[PDB]
């Protein structure tokens, strides 16, 4: 039925469809005009410590890709409960294809049964996994993989051993059908300790990936580079944004790897091919609120932008000019998505209370009768002598 396949090529995003879920957060440096920040400090919210999250779940990337005019299908499992059906509704309205979504009447969305040990130090040892960890190999939609030209997945699908085998099966099937494999690291919280565990866990999927995207912090962690630059200092020194030479990332290279993308938020995106390497400057002075401070919207927007460009010109995966254009397009997509999320969520003042940025920048009258800015009676005046 390849005569029925349209344009752009379908992209299969594989994993979990969570709601406002963050895998991890690392200290980061962003490009910023600190003269403006001092002038606007009383009106522009900034975090005390800038910590950036790599991104979100596979579901958010599918939603972001559909917003760019792409064609995205989400492959995963949701429960038949109300929350699972609400998430399925949200994906369909965002025009993500959910024919590859398995609805499980036996499993529960976003809830896992753990057996907490009360003998020594506390341990958890999950017993009954949630709905978005129980996709089986028999439940893989091979029809979606046949149409899809790119297969997207993240490390979160490798955490559960049952779910890891399904991810490996889906990847192997996709490679047989000539799909490009896009591996977005987005390293989950437990894996940031014991680098040796991380290498063993991701080694098999790493060698099967044609395109890999990592953050600058993730690249340093996998390469055994201890962070040496400063954090949260009011300058834009080039040591905070260093383009590593290709020899530094060679130990992570493998035979079938086409492109390696290294992200530093929307501030800077680095790219590495077998022949070419380079970097593109961006902009990360976007409106940020306490509800959006982890910058996970940018990460999903960046990856969606990369996927959109790589899929419409798949033969230009080694053209240096197209790579620079692709990196700049991803930066713009991340900036817009972060900017939109600030407007949607707003500021702190299901009981959830939010105010607009107009209300956030509204000061108090200072009309206190005891206060020094109003007209007191003639008694307490103290007319300041000229």
């Amino acid at each position: 039925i390849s005569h029925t396949y349209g344009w752009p090529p379908l992209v299969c995003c594989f994993g979990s469809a969570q709601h406002a879920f963050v895998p991890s957060g690392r200290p980061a440096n962003r490009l910023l005009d600190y003269e403006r920040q001092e002038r606007m400090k009383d009106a522009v919210w900034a975090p005390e410590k800038y910590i950036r999250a790599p991104g979100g779940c596979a579901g958010g990337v599918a939603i972001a890709l559909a917003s760019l005019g792409g064609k995205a299908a989400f492959m995963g499992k949701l429960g038949d409960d109300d929350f699972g059906q609400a998430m399925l509704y949200y994906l369909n309205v965002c025009q993500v294809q959910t024919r590859s979504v398995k609805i499980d009447s036996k499993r529960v969305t976003a809830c896992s049964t753990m057996k907490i040990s009360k003998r020594g130090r506390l341990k958890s040892t999950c017993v009954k996994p949630c709905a978005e960890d129980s996709l089986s190999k028999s439940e893989i939609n091979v029809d979606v993989l046949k149409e899809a030209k790119m297969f997207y997945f993240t490390t979160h699908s490798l955490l559960d051993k049952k779910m890891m085998s399904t991810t490996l099966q889906a990847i192997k099937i996709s490679k047989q059908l000539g799909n490009v494999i896009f591996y977005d690291l987005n390293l989950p919280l437990p894996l940031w300790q014991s680098l040796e565990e991380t290498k063993s866990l991701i080694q098999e999927v790493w060698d099967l990936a044609d395109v890999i995207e990592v953050t600058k912090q993730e690249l340093e962690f996998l390469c055994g580079i201890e962070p040496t630059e400063e954090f949260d200092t009011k300058n834009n020194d080039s040591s905070k944004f260093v383009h590593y030479e290709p020899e530094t990332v060679e130990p992570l290279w493998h035979e079938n790897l086409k492109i390696l993308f290294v992200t530093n938020g929307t501030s800077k995106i680095h790219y590495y091919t077998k022949e070419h390497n380079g970097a593109v400057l961006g902009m990360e002075d976007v409106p940020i609120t306490p509800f959006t401070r982890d910058m996970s919207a940018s990460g999903d927007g960046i990856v969606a932008g990369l996927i959109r460009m790589l899929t419409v010109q798949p033969d230009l995966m080694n053209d240096k000019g197209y790579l620079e254009r692709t990196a700049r397009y991803a930066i713009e997509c991340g900036v817009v998505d972060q900017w939109l999320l600030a407007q949607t969520r707003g500021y702190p003042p299901n009981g959830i209370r939010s105010i607009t940025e107009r209300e956030y920048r509204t000061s108090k009258p200072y009309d206190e009768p005891d206060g020094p800015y109003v007209m007191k009676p003639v008694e307490e005046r103290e007319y300041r002598k000229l």
């Binding site: 969570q18 709601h19 406002a20 879920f21 963050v22 895998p23 991890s24 957060g25 975090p47 410590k49 910590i51 999250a53 109300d82 929350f83 976003a110 809830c111 896992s112 049964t113 753990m114 057996k115 907490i116 009360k118 130090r121 506390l122 341990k123 958890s124 040892t125 999950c126 017993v127 949630c130 979160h156 955490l159 989950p188 919280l189 437990p190 300790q193 609120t289 306490p290 509800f291 959006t292 401070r293 982890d294 996970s296 969520r345 702190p348 299901n350 009981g351 959830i352 209370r353």
Partner: protein, 108 residues
């Protein structure tokens, strides 16, 4: 009131016994959705004034304890029953208030 606790205070609180369900809110200061989760939990705490206990643990301070509890991201809630035979429930992401009420009543 939702109280901040360390890893040792929570161990003393889990090993001990109680007559109400215990909600543990793993969070970090840098996570936007965790701030939204804080607003939901304080509404829930008011609804169940004494019928439940809500505590929060900073995963940045207690990354070893967060890992040993198999916290894979934020926000993350643990619903711990006062009945020892019952097993706890781990929820991930920003879940609606009604699900918390269902968890507390039906299985906690």
């Amino acid at each position: 009131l939702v109280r901040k606790l360390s890893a040792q205070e929570l161990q003393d609180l889990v090993k001990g016994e109680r007559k109400v369900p215990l909600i543990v809110d793993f969070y970090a200061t840098w996570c936007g959705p965790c701030i939204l989760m804080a607003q939901e939990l304080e509404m829930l705490a008011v609804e169940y004034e004494s019928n439940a206990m809500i505590v929060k643990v900073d995963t940045d301070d207690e990354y070893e304890f967060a890992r040993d509890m198999q916290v894979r991201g934020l926000p993350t809630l643990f619903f711990i029953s006062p009945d020892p035979s019952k097993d706890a429930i781990r929820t991930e992401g920003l879940i609606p208030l009604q699900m918390m009420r269902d968890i507390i009543d039906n299985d906690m």
